[PDB]
């Protein structure tokens, strides 16, 4: 029913937490996304008081380059990130937002609860 779908998988590792994402074109048509900088996504890890614990974007510099990307019918754009410190046990939420903009598409974002144990 939705043309594009973003999935998030959060996996607790020994030294860190890993986030695997896949932006999937489920439509029958190719879809173009445009970006105004090199940055492809944003990822933010919220705690139970909605304070930010991690932001992919902090500590990074992106080129001010326009980009033009086509996701074919069925194609996925796969991407991941590592949060380099396990926090304390509890439930958290990761919100990934895709920075590419498709004509006649709401911006693509997903959220995902995950427990650190």
Numbering used by the authors: 3 to 119
Question: Would you copy out the relevant sentences from the publication that reported this structure?
Answer:
The structure of IPI is a variant of the all-beta, immunoglobulin (Ig) fold. It is possible that IPI is important for protein-protein interactions, of which inhibition of Isp1 is one. IPI homologues are found in both bacteria and archaea, but no homologues have been detected in eukaryotes.
Bacillus subtilis was determined to 2.6 Å resolution by the MAD method. 29 shows that 98.0% of the residues are in favoured regions, with no outliers. Two residues, Lys 86 and Glu 87, are flagged as having unusual Ramachandran plot properties by the PDB validation report although not with Molprobity. Electron density for them strongly supports their modelled conformations. The structure has an unusual Ig-like fold. Protruding loops on the right hand side form a wedge shape. Remarkably, we find that the region at the edge of the IPI wedge structure could interact with subtilisin in a manner strongly reminiscent of inhibition modes of other subtilisin family inhibitors. Chagasin and amoebiasin have similar topologies, but the order of the beta strands differs significantly between these two I42 family members and IPI. This implies that IPI is not closely related to the I42 family, and that the similar folds may have been acquired independently by convergent evolution. However, the tertiary structure and docking predictions illustrate how it could feasibly inhibit its cognate enzyme.
